[PDB]
């Protein structure tokens, strides 16, 4: 590559794997979204929340791919595994699965940051800082908040709690 | 008829019966609507939902009648039977009765489509496709959703659930 | 399902497979798009054309999933295979691969239409008619046109032809 | 200096040398710009591209000088060497010389970042991250793209290719 400079093969590979993880996450959110749109689940606000996250994760992958091209790396795509479940249980179960997912993306972002630091690649480090690490921290906080409110609600009267959360928070 | 072309007597008759079914449905919804406006039921949002459906069904009948005239068929009207109940129970009972009603209209629309197909009447088929079959599918989905939410709500505290559904969904 | 009516398991399954094919197509277009954004390929208009198609195919899948929920079917997601190539050659090679892809989606849409017809499912038939079959026909025509123009251009002076196509058509 | 804090003499010196390199680059671009404005070269779009880069590099130097004052360092200016050529050959030759130049600025920015990291100077590191490293990466990508397009064009018919690039890309 005429342009490639200070961009290790190790970072390039890790960026490709991070793209796969974000597309996998987007796919998980698409599945969570359409589950909550089932006539026998019918929580539109929960569906809308997850459809929006499917879009953000897809945009995450696209920014990574653009960055990969800008540094002179080569995008390589792999099979995208299907989501870990076909049915996602209650809003509580789903929001728990979403926090697990986001923390695993976050950890992957931190691992890549560590690698960039080890390879003295400040451009990589700054690009993760600017566009990924703060968004993940904010999102995980918002999910933790939602989780707390769902739990407080689904003490007695679980059905009533799920409905009220969907109507008044989402 | 100077204009009538490729329009069987079998289709004409079935269109007249479909008009009767839509007017009967409109009448059912008028009765459901005013039941929920009773001072001893007093669920305004439920009343408004059914009054709106009374209007859509009436419009359904009018489009069918207009189509019948456009093809050179002859509208024939019959007695309209009164609704199947005088009192409609809870929001849950009503929404169940409404889904039963809509599925019976839907089936009548499918039977007429089958007949149009058998008679090689693509105009009839397209007119049902365009104006009736998709609307019924969307409406039945919306009713199934409402039904799911009512059920989730009326676990314990049935009165509280019915109130919240009316206030926050309808 | 309280709502499901005239929706065979055979159609439900075929809809799920069609969703997989559209997501696979979207993924192919994402890969074609970022290939043309490589510093050593650098045909921005070609990149933009394929990124737009990635978005349309994703929207295709989402409309199918919404329809599946509306009929009372159950979305099931599978692994998404990676695109058939990692590097896509010239604009000519890419546009040929895109036409092959679209014709395979089109054929899948026709097969599903045939099945809907066999199962007397006019709602399915109309939904494919309205939202998929005409778009595919228009898109394939636009790709055939592009292909003809690329070929006319890359007689002698292949590099000059590819550049001019990107600048003046895309 | 009353204000100077955590700002090593090693960083101060390196900032002064980086200022010299950016002013030298600005001067190179001024020379490239006016070469392409010669009546016997007459590629206005190429002239405009390089004049714009002369301005960006000058602005780069000014931001560095402002930063040097903000940290309590002392700007020191040195002789600015004249550009490495008096005539710059074809658009292809010029864009190659420009990529070489930018990569040498980029490397200087990375070396300074490394030094800031070694000296535990996070303000320096963040200031380079924010205002210099991403701009260089984007610019080098844009130059690599331009280079690819020029090369594709100047296969046969070099004169025709240079003209078309200037008219339709720049
Ligand atoms: Cl290097
Ligand atoms: Cl006739
Ligand atoms: Cl059935
Ligand atoms: Cl100090
Ligand atoms: Fe959105
Ligand atoms: Fe966003
Ligand atoms: Fe968004
Ligand atoms: Fe967005
Ligand atoms: Fe940093
Ligand atoms: Fe930083
Ligand atoms: Fe109205
Ligand atoms: Fe209407
Ligand atoms: Fe209306
Ligand atoms: Fe109206
Ligand atoms: Fe038809
Ligand atoms: Fe778009
Ligand atoms: Fe679209
Ligand atoms: Fe679009
Ligand atoms: Fe769109
Ligand atoms: Fe049809
Ligand atoms: Fe049709
Ligand atoms: Fe300017
Ligand atoms: Fe500027
Ligand atoms: Fe400027
Ligand atoms: Fe400026
Ligand atoms: Fe830092
Ligand atoms: O977004
Ligand atoms: O309506
Ligand atoms: O779209
Ligand atoms: O600038």
Curated annotation (Swiss-Prot), chains A, B, C, D:
Region entry Catalytic site for iron oxidation, spans: 52-59
Superkingdom of this protein's organism: Eukaryota
Subcellular location, record wording: Cytoplasmic vesicle, Autophagosome; Cytoplasm; Autolysosome
Chief location of this protein within or outside the cell: cytoplasm
CDD domains: Ferritin (cd00904)
Keywords: Acetylation, Cytoplasm, Cytoplasmic vesicle, Iron, Iron storage, Lysosome, Metal-binding
GO MF annotations, alphabetized: ferric iron binding; ferrous iron binding; iron ion binding
GO CC list: autolysosome; autophagosome; cytoplasm; cytoplasmic vesicle; ferritin complex
One record GO biological process: iron ion transport
Pfam families the record matches: Ferritin
Binding positions (Fe cation): 52, 55-56, 59, 62
Ranges for domain Ferritin-like diiron: 5-154
Known partners and oligomeric status: Oligomer of 24 subunits. There are two types of subunits: L (light) chain and H (heavy) chain. The major chain can be light or heavy, depending on the species and tissue type. The functional molecule forms a roughly spherical shell with a diameter of 12 nm and contains a central cavity into which the insoluble mineral iron core is deposited. Interacts with NCOA4.
Role: Stores iron in a soluble, non-toxic, readily available form. Important for iron homeostasis. Iron is taken up in the ferrous form and deposited as ferric hydroxides after oxidation. Also plays a role in delivery of iron to cells. Mediates iron uptake in capsule cells of the developing kidney. Delivery to lysosomes by the cargo receptor NCOA4 for autophagic degradation and release or iron.
Something else known: In horse spleen the light chain is the major chain.
Family: Belongs to the ferritin family.
Protein name per Swiss-Prot or TrEMBL: Ferritin light chain
């Amino acid at each position: 590559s005429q342009i490639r400079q200070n961009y290790s093969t190790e970072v390039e590979a890790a960026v490709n794997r991070l793209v796969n993880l974000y597309l996998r996450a987007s796919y998980t959110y698409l599945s969570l979204g359409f589950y909550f749109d089932r006539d026998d689940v019918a929580l539109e606000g929960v569906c809308h929340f997850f459809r929006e996250l499917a879009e953000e994760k897809r945009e995450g992958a696209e920014r990574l791919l653009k960055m990969q091209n800008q540094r002179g790396g080569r995008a390589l795509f792999q099979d995208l595994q299907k989501p870990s479940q076909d049915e996602w249980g209650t809003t509580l179960d789903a929001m728990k699965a979403a926090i697990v997912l986001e923390k695993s993306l976050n950890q992957a972002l931190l691992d890549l940051h560590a690698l960039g630091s080890a390879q003295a690649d400040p451009h990589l480090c700054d690009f993760l800082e600017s566009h990924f690490l703060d968004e993940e921290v904010k999102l995980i906080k918002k999910m933790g908040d939602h989780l707390t409110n769902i739990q407080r609600l689904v003490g007695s009267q679980a059905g009533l709690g799920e409905y009220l959360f969907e109507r008044l928070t989402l």
